[PDB]
Ligand binder design. Structure first.
Ligand SMILES: *[C@@H]1O[C@H](CO)[C@@H](O)[C@H](O)[C@H]1NC(C)=O
Ligand SMILES: *[C@@H]1O[C@H](CO)[C@@H](O)[C@H](O)[C@H]1NC(C)=O
Ligand SMILES: *[C@@H]1O[C@H](CO)[C@@H](O)[C@H](O)[C@H]1NC(C)=O
Ligand SMILES: *[C@@H]1O[C@H](CO)[C@@H](O)[C@H](O)[C@H]1NC(C)=O
Ligand SMILES: *[C@@H]1O[C@H](CO)[C@@H](O)[C@H](O)[C@H]1NC(C)=O
Lengths: 49, 255, 294, 49
C-alpha cells in the first residue's frame, strides 16, 4: 500500500501547476512565445524535480 | 388588496442537490471537489404560492425543486434590479420547446402568463442580447434544477427524477446532469418564479435552497454515474471520510 | 543506458464541423466603434475563426498578443471570444501593457494579469477624422474607486465631492467627467483616433466549437498517432472503448488524473487512449576485456 | 524581449542578447529641408524575421 500510495502521489503531483498558468506542457508549447513561457516551464520543472 | 401571497415553511434538504462539477468521465473512483454545493441536511424554504415577499436573493446560486404532477410551473426571471434599467433573463417553457431570452421584458411584482395560446403577453422585444431555443426542460415526478453564475457563464443543471409511490423527498441520490451553459456575462442578484395560471383558481408549491462554497466527496460507479456523496463539514464522521478519501472508515483515531 | 520510445507515425486533428464562419468582418469595418466609455462587447462562438481576414486589413499599428502566440491562432481552439471594440488616442494605446499605468487602463478598461488575448490597434485618421471633429468619442476621467478587470462603468453615480453641488453651473472644482476627444488632423502621432479591438480568448474545460481552418484527418486505430481532439493534444494509440460516457461529457480520466478516453467530435464514439510503447534499454555485456559482444 | 513592428520587420534581437544600445540625436547632421528619403523602413513582410 505504501509503494502504491507513493506512486499515486507522484503521478498526482504531475498535475500540480506550481504557480504556472497551466499544468499541461504541450499546451503551453503551442500557447505562448518562448521567452515568456520559459519562466512557467521553470516553475513546473522545479516543482516536478 | 394583496393579490400575491406566498406562505413559507422550512423543510429538510436530506441528501439532495449534488451535481456534476465538470463534464469529465470518471469510473470506480472517489473524487473530492470544492465548489458551490447545497449543504446536506440544510434548511430549504418551501414556498406555497396561492393567487408579500417577491424578493428572493440569489446569493451564490439557487436550488429549485418542483414536485407537482399538474405541471403548473413555467419559467423563471433572473434580474439584478428587476426593472427596465438593467437587462434580465427570462425563461419560457411550453410543450413544443423552451425559449431562453436575455431581454428586458417588463413585468411588475406579479409576473405571469396568459395561459389556448399566450400571444397576448408581448407584442415585441425592446433589446435582446442573447437568445436560445431547445427541447423543453420539463417533461409523480421531481424536477430538480440548480442555477449558478461563475466567471461570466450562467450554468443550469437538471434532473427529472421519477419518484416511486411515496409522499416526500426520498433519501436517494439524484445527481443533476447539466443542460445548458450560456456565456451571458450579466450580474444577477434576485430571481422570481413564474407560476402558470389560465384564464383564476391556481396554486403552486416549490422548494428553494441556497448553495454555499463547500468541499464534497463524490463516488462514481463503474458506469460513470454518481451513487453517493459526502459533505465534509457536516459532521466529524464525514470529515474523517474526506480525510481518508474512503466511504468506509475503519476503527481507530484519525486526526 | 538509454530509454526507448515509439515515435508517432502520423498526426490526426479532429475539429467539429461548422460551415458558418465567425463575424470577424463585422467587428472590424463597422464604420462606428461607439466610444471608449461604452465599448462594444461582442460574443464570438460556434463559428469558423479565420484569422487571415484580420491580416487582410490595413497594416496594424499594434498587433500585440499576450497569452497567445499570434502565429498559432489558427491551430489553437478557444471556447469564447470577447471582442471589446473602442477608439482611443494613440499615446494611450501604449498604456494597455504590463507594467504601464494610465488613465485608460484604470478608468476605461482594465485587463487581468492572466489575460489571454490580442490587442489589435490601427489608425483611421484618413477615415474617422474631420475638421469639425467627432465629438461622440468621450472618456470618463472621474470615478469613486478603481475598475476591477473586465468592468464597464456607465452609470451616472452621484459625485458629491464638495458640500454644495455645482447644480449645472461653473465653479471651483466643477468639471465635466466626460472629456470629448480632440480630433484635429493637424495633430501628430499621439492624438489621432485609433480603433482598438481586444480579442479576449476565454478558454476552459468545455466544448470549444471554435477552431480554425484545419482540414480534419481520417481517424486511425492501433497506431501511435499524435491526436488533437478539440485542442487536447497527446501521443497514444486509439482503441474503440467499451466504456459508456454519459451524453454530456467528452473526456475521461482515471485515478491518476490523466486523459484516458476521448469522445470524437464528428462521430460520437468513445476512444480509449493508451500510451504507445515506452521503456528502458539495458546493455547486457561481459567485460570489454573478454569480448565486445553485447 | 521587446516586440513591435520594428522588432520583427526591421531589426530583431535575441532574448539572451548581451550588448549595449547607444542612441543619440543627429537631426542637425542627417536631416535636410528637402527631406532625406534614403532612410526607409519595411513595415510589411510575409513572415517575421
Ligand atoms: C411555444 O413557445 C414558442 C416561443 O418561441 C412558440 O414559438 C411556439 O409556437 C409555442 N408553441 C405552441 C404555442 O404550441
Ligand atoms: C434598449 O437599449 C437601449 C440602448 O442601451 C436603451 O436606451 C433602452 O432603454 C433599452 N430598452 C428599451 C426600452 O428599448
Ligand atoms: C452501467 O453499465 C453496465 C454495463 O456496461 C451495467 O451492468 C450497469 O448496471 C450500468 N449502471 C447502472 C448503475 O445501472
Ligand atoms: C466597411 O463597411 C461598409 C459597411 O458598413 C462597407 O460599405 C465598406 O465597403 C467597408 N469597407 C471596408 C472594408 O473598409
Ligand atoms: C458533421 O458533424 C456531424 C455531427 O457529428 C456528423 O454527423 C457528420 O457526419 C459530419 N459531417 C462530415 C464530417 O462531413
Amino acid at each position: 500500500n505504501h509503494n502504491a500510495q507513493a506512486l499515486n502521489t507522484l503521478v498526482k503531483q504531475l498535475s500540480s501547476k506550481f504557480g504556472a498558468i497551466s499544468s499541461v506542457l504541450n499546451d503551453i508549447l503551442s500557447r505562448l512565445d518562448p521567452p515568456e513561457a520559459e519562466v512557467q516551464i521553470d516553475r513546473l520543472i522545479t516543482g516536478r524535480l | 388588496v394583496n393579490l400575491i401571497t406566498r406562505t413559507q415553511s422550512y423543510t429538510n434538504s436530506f441528501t439532495r442537490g449534488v451535481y456534476y462539477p465538470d463534464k469529465v468521465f470518471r469510473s470506480s473512483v472517489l473524487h473530492s471537489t470544492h465548489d458551490l454545493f447545497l449543504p446536506f441536511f440544510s434548511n430549504v424554504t418551501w414556498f406555497h404560492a396561492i393567487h408579500d415577499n417577491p424578493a428572493l436573493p440569489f446569493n451564490d446560486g439557487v436550488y429549485f425543486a418542483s414536485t407537482e404532477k399538474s405541471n403548473i410551473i413555467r419559467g423563471w426571471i433572473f434580474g439584478t434590479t428587476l426593472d427596465s434599467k438593467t437587462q434580465s433573463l427570462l425563461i419560457v417553457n411550453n410543450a413544443t420547446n423552451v425559449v431562453i431570452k436575455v431581454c428586458e421584458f417588463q413585468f411588475c411584482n406579479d409576473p405571469f402568463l396568459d395561459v389556448e395560446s399566450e400571444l397576448r403577453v408581448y407584442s415585441s422585444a425592446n433589446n435582446c442580447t442573447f437568445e436560445y431555443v431547445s427541447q423543453p426542460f420539463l417533461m409523480k415526478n421531481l424536477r430538480e434544477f440548480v442555477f449558478k453564475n461563475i466567471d461570466g457563464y450562467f450554468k443550469i443543471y437538471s434532473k427529472h427524477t421519477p419518484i416511486n409511490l411515496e409522499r416526500d423527498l426520498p433519501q436517494g441520490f439524484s445527481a443533476l446532469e447539466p443542460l445548458v451553459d450560456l456565456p451571458i456575462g450579466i450580474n444577477i442578484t434576485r430571481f422570481q418564479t413564474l407560476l402558470a395560471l389560465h384564464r383564476t383558481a391556481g396554486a403552486a408549491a416549490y422548494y428553494v435552497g441556497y448553495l454555499q462554497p463547500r468541499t464534497f466527496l463524490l463516488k462514481y460507479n463503474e458506469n460513470g454515474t454518481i451513487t453517493d456523496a459526502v459533505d465534509c463539514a457536516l459532521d466529524p464522521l464525514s470529515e474523517t471520510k474526506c480525510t481518508l478519501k474512503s466511504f468506509t472508515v475503519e476503527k481507530g483515531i484519525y486526526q | 543506458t538509454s530509454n526507448f520510445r515509439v515515435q508517432p507515425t502520423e498526426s490526426i486533428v479532429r475539429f467539429p464541423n461548422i460551415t458558418n464562419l465567425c463575424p470577424f468582418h463585422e467587428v472590424f469595418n463597422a464604420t462606428t466603434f461607439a466610444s471608449v466609455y461604452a465599448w462594444n462587447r461582442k460574443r464570438i462562438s460556434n463559428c469558423v475563426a479565420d484569422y487571415s481576414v484580420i491580416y487582410n486589413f490595413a497594416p496594424f499599428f499594434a498587433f500585440k498578443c499576450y497569452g497567445v502566440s499570434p502565429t498559432k491562432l489558427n491551430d489553437l481552439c478557444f471556447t469564447n471570444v470577447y471582442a471589446d471594440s473602442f477608439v482611443i488616442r494613440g499615446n494611450e494605446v501604449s498604456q494597455i501593457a504590463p507594467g504601464q499605468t494610465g488613465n485608460i487602463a484604470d478608468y476605461n478598461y482594465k485587463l487581468p494579469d492572466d489575460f489571454t488575448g490580442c490587442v489589435i490597434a490601427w489608425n483611421s485618421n484618413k477615415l474617422d477624422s474631420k475638421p469639425s471633429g467627432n465629438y461622440n468619442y468621450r472618456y470618463r476621467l472621474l470615478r469613486k474607486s478603481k475598475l476591477k478587470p473586465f468592468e464597464r462603468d456607465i452609470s451616472t453615480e452621484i459625485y458629491q465631492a464638495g458640500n454644495k453641488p455645482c447644480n449645472g453651473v461653473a465653479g471651483p472644482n466643477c468639471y465635466s467627467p466626460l472629456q470629448s476627444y480632440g480630433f484635429r488632423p493637424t495633430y501628430g502621432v499621439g492624438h489621432q483616433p485609433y480603433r482598438v479591438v481586444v480579442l479576449s480568448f476565454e478558454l476552459l474545460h468545455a466544448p470549444a466549437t471554435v477552431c480554425g481552418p484545419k482540414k480534419s484527418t481520417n481517424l486511425v486505430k492501433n497506431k501511435c498517432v499524435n491526436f488533437n481532439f478539440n485542442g487536447l493534444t497527446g501521443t497514444g494509440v486509439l482503441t474503440e472503448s467499451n466504456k459508456k460516457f454519459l451524453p454530456f461529457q467528452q473526456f475521461g480520466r482515471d485515478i491518476a488524473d490523466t486523459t484516458d478516453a476521448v469522445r470524437d467530435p464528428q462521430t460520437l464514439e468513445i476512444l480509449d487512449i493508451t500510451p504507445c510503447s515506452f521503456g528502458g534499454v539495458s546493455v547486457i555485456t561481459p567485460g570489454t576485456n573478454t569480448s565486445n559482444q553485447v
